[PDB]
Design a protein around this motif. Structure first.
Motif, PDB file in Angstrom:
ATOM      1  N   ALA A  34      54.994 -34.762 -22.947  1.00 44.31           N
ATOM      2  CA  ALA A  34      56.275 -34.059 -23.422  1.00 44.31           C
ATOM      3  C   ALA A  34      56.501 -34.818 -24.588  1.00 44.31           C
ATOM      4  CB  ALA A  34      57.411 -33.991 -22.540  1.00 44.31           C
ATOM      5  N   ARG A  35      56.523 -36.166 -24.558  1.00 47.41           N
ATOM      6  CA  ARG A  35      56.839 -37.349 -25.625  1.00 47.41           C
ATOM      7  C   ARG A  35      56.149 -38.483 -25.611  1.00 47.41           C
ATOM      8  NH1 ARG A  35      59.433 -35.195 -29.293  1.00 47.41           N
ATOM      9  NH2 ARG A  35      59.305 -37.303 -29.841  1.00 47.41           N
ATOM     10  N   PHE A  80      56.062 -18.641 -16.062  1.00 49.43           N
ATOM     11  CA  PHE A  80      56.639 -19.751 -16.497  1.00 49.43           C
ATOM     12  C   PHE A  80      55.747 -20.547 -17.480  1.00 49.43           C
ATOM     13  CE2 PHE A  80      56.813 -24.514 -15.868  1.00 49.43           C
ATOM     14  CZ  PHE A  80      57.752 -24.728 -16.706  1.00 49.43           C
ATOM     15  N   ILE A 164      52.858 -26.790 -31.109  1.00 47.30           N
ATOM     16  CA  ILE A 164      54.129 -27.877 -31.052  1.00 47.30           C
ATOM     17  C   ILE A 164      53.675 -29.263 -31.574  1.00 47.30           C
ATOM     18  CG2 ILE A 164      53.741 -28.141 -28.651  1.00 47.30           C
ATOM     19  CD1 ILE A 164      57.095 -28.190 -30.446  1.00 47.30           C
ATOM     20  N   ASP A 168      55.674 -31.305 -34.214  1.00 45.94           N
ATOM     21  CA  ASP A 168      56.124 -32.461 -33.865  1.00 45.94           C
ATOM     22  C   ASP A 168      55.677 -33.497 -34.687  1.00 45.94           C
ATOM     23  OD1 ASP A 168      57.900 -34.064 -31.738  1.00 45.94           O
ATOM     24  OD2 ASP A 168      55.988 -35.070 -31.418  1.00 45.94           O
TER      25      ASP A 168
ATOM     26  N   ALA B  62      64.447 -34.450 -27.808  1.00 43.18           N
ATOM     27  CA  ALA B  62      63.843 -35.090 -29.094  1.00 43.18           C
ATOM     28  C   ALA B  62      63.072 -34.147 -29.744  1.00 43.18           C
ATOM     29  CB  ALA B  62      62.902 -36.171 -28.463  1.00 43.18           C
ATOM     30  N   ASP B  63      63.087 -32.710 -29.315  1.00 43.76           N
ATOM     31  CA  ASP B  63      62.060 -31.870 -30.158  1.00 43.76           C
ATOM     32  C   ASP B  63      62.321 -30.518 -29.664  1.00 43.76           C
ATOM     33  OD1 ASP B  63      59.940 -30.700 -28.106  1.00 43.76           O
ATOM     34  OD2 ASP B  63      60.004 -32.669 -27.367  1.00 43.76           O
ATOM     35  N   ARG B  64      61.696 -29.430 -30.290  1.00 42.93           N
ATOM     36  CA  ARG B  64      62.250 -27.996 -30.205  1.00 42.93           C
ATOM     37  C   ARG B  64      61.893 -27.558 -28.637  1.00 42.93           C
ATOM     38  NH1 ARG B  64      58.203 -23.318 -30.974  1.00 42.93           N
ATOM     39  NH2 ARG B  64      56.665 -25.255 -31.482  1.00 42.93           N
ATOM     40  N   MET B  65      60.577 -27.899 -28.166  1.00 44.63           N
ATOM     41  CA  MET B  65      60.255 -27.745 -26.911  1.00 44.63           C
ATOM     42  C   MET B  65      60.630 -28.557 -25.863  1.00 44.63           C
ATOM     43  SD  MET B  65      58.257 -24.793 -25.807  1.00 44.63           S
ATOM     44  CE  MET B  65      56.922 -25.993 -24.808  1.00 44.63           C
ATOM     45  N   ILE B  67      60.490 -29.947 -22.822  1.00 44.68           N
ATOM     46  CA  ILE B  67      59.671 -29.822 -21.566  1.00 44.68           C
ATOM     47  C   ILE B  67      60.335 -30.116 -20.557  1.00 44.68           C
ATOM     48  CG2 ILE B  67      57.841 -30.914 -20.352  1.00 44.68           C
ATOM     49  CD1 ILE B  67      57.373 -28.271 -22.138  1.00 44.68           C
ATOM     50  N   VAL B  68      61.190 -31.357 -20.389  1.00 42.78           N
ATOM     51  CA  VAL B  68      61.780 -31.490 -19.296  1.00 42.78           C
ATOM     52  C   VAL B  68      62.870 -30.794 -18.834  1.00 42.78           C
ATOM     53  CG1 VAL B  68      62.928 -33.721 -18.171  1.00 42.78           C
ATOM     54  CG2 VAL B  68      61.049 -34.046 -19.613  1.00 42.78           C
ATOM     55  N   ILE B  70      63.386 -27.436 -19.551  1.00 42.42           N
ATOM     56  CA  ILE B  70      62.745 -26.153 -19.124  1.00 42.42           C
ATOM     57  C   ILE B  70      62.312 -26.407 -17.855  1.00 42.42           C
ATOM     58  CG2 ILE B  70      62.993 -25.309 -21.690  1.00 42.42           C
ATOM     59  CD1 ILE B  70      59.631 -25.546 -21.217  1.00 42.42           C
ATOM     60  N   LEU B  71      61.631 -27.369 -17.485  1.00 41.25           N
ATOM     61  CA  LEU B  71      60.914 -27.630 -16.245  1.00 41.25           C
ATOM     62  C   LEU B  71      62.072 -27.712 -15.032  1.00 41.25           C
ATOM     63  CD1 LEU B  71      58.419 -27.582 -14.810  1.00 41.25           C
ATOM     64  CD2 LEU B  71      57.988 -29.983 -15.390  1.00 41.25           C
TER      65      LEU B  71
END
Ligand SMILES: CC(C)CCC[C@@H](C)[C@H]1CC[C@H]2[C@@H]3CC=C4C[C@@H](OC(=O)CCC(=O)O)CC[C@]4(C)[C@H]3CC[C@]12C
Ligand SMILES: CC(C)CCC[C@@H](C)[C@H]1CC[C@H]2[C@@H]3CC=C4C[C@@H](OC(=O)CCC(=O)O)CC[C@]4(C)[C@H]3CC[C@]12C
Ligand SMILES: CC(C)CCC[C@@H](C)[C@H]1CC[C@H]2[C@@H]3CC=C4C[C@@H](OC(=O)CCC(=O)O)CC[C@]4(C)[C@H]3CC[C@]12C
Ligand SMILES: CC(C)CCC[C@@H](C)[C@H]1CC[C@H]2[C@@H]3CC=C4C[C@@H](OC(=O)CCC(=O)O)CC[C@]4(C)[C@H]3CC[C@]12C
Lengths: 218, 212
Positions: A34-35, A80, A164, A168, B62-65, B67-68, B70-71
């Protein structure tokens, strides 16, 4: 008892368990990437595994697993995962299980790694701005190439995002260049702008006054 | 990249969300969702709050997607629509007494359904066991819509709802022990008599006016 309602079928338990560890692995890989976002370039094998394992289930266990309950875990979890892939637009920068997209993505990530190599040994944020300035512009020009290409090769909708981790990576270095390093230098042509603007804005004052005065005189 | 103390709030949330997703699937066909990994969902929610308690900037938006985000939203929506809150108590570290009572009744009800297979004996031996389970389930339907003040009776805990549907389909569909009483002839007689009344009324009114 019938081997459907109170217990799982022998061939349906393994199919559900097979899809269970595949979905667990994808979810773990989604968070770890994710990051900084390395989603589409790391989770593309595990996402394909989940989609394939969904197909095996939805081929001889579809009735007993897909819509057997009011809440459908496998349906919503796979939906999902699909929504995450579509919103991340990982279809771009992935040409049929291939890592790249006509080599554009690996070239970008190779450029992004090359560009970010500047911002490490050029600190000791002054020397970075002018030494490899063209490296940032080379990467920045390539990024604009994909935007127009994304509207031509793909042609989904004007304003559609790329995958992404590519998007990013641009923002990581855009904020590392124009925000932390302050290497962006607009010319800021201001005094001629003021002189031209006041001259134009003064024209209606002349026109309305002259029209009024000329009519009054005659 | 992120600082090492920031790749600790994302790595622990990674394995917590991974194992919750593993349990959500392996506890799906016989639905034991809210009773198998109710602590795993609590762990995910707590470990999400740890992030928002020093990595919220670096991980959440921190960004567009996100993740944390939406999860966690997906896990929350799964918990909310499954109504797993009803399954456990208000303090929510163990199953409710009513839910615990239903589950052992469900096991007790399903015990004769296997014992009396070797379906005439099933419909007689513990038919009342099905009805006391069915009565208890209807008891929680009204109790649930008073506890949370839900206007309709819509959704209980998915473990309880699936357990009853398993029993109902095992009783009225495979064992066909549900035998309603029908009186077709008395229904036909009264319905024909009532439907024949407007025929008399309209004809008599017409004939009466015809006669002078
Ligand atoms: C004579 C009558 C009829 C018209 C009067 C017009 C003024 C009210 C306007 C015209 C141009 C304007 C100026 C245009 C640009 C700027 C720059 C602006 O800020 C900057 O210095 C930005 C510099 C940059 O962005 O690089 C501050 C306001 C100011 C002086 C403006 C102040 C108001 C001004 C003088
Ligand atoms: C925020 C602004 C920049 C938006 C655009 C609006 C103005 C540029 C316009 C709106 C109305 C205009 C005014 C309408 C009428 C007149 C009257 C005219 O002179 C008079 O007063 C004539 C009658 C008299 O002598 O009493 C001079 C121009 C002026 C001020 C005009 C100048 C331009 C104005 C202010
Ligand atoms: C005298 C005139 C003015 C009215 C005549 C009305 C008839 C056309 C209606 C009235 C009652 C009806 C009956 C009411 C109930 C039934 C039972 C029904 O059987 C079932 O489906 C029973 C099992 C089940 O309940 O699922 C079949 C149709 C039938 C005979 C109906 C056939 C049509 C009937 C005779
Ligand atoms: C049962 C459901 C599917 C339909 C519900 C409507 C019927 C029950 C109603 C609609 C119109 C009614 C009819 C309206 C008028 C007449 C005429 C009336 O007298 C005559 O037949 C002579 C009239 C003349 O000579 O002018 C007898 C009853 C009847 C058939 C009525 C019987 C009851 C009817 C069919």
């Amino acid at each position: 008892l019938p081997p459907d309602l109170p217990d799982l079928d022998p061939e349906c338990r393994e199919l559900l368990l097979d899809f269970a560890n595949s979905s667990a692995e994808l979810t773990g890989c989604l968070v770890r990437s994710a990051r900084p976002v390395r989603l589409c370039q790391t989770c593309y094998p595990l996402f394909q595994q989940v989609v394939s394992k969904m197909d095996n289930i939805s081929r001889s266990c579809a009735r007993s697993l897909l819509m057997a309950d009011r809440m459908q875990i496998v349906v919503i979890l796979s939906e999902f995962f699909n929504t995450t892939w579509q919103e991340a637009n990982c279809a771009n920068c992935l040409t049929n299980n291939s890592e790249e997209l006509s080599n554009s993505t690996v070239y970008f990530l190779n450029l992004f790694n090359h560009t970010l190599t500047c911002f490490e040994h050029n600190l000791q944020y002054s020397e970075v701005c002018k030494n490899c300035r063209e490296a940032y512009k080379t990467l920045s020009s390539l990024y604009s190439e994909m935007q127009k290409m994304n509207e031509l090769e793909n042609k989904a909708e004007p304003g559609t995002h790329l995958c992404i981790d590519v998007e990013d990576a641009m923002n990581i270095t855009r904020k590392l260049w124009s925000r932390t390093f302050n290497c962006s230098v607009p010319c800021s042509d201001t005094v001629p702008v003021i002189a031209v603007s006041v001259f134009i804005l003064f024209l209606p004052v002349v026109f309305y006054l002259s029209s009024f005065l000329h009519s009054e005189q005659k």
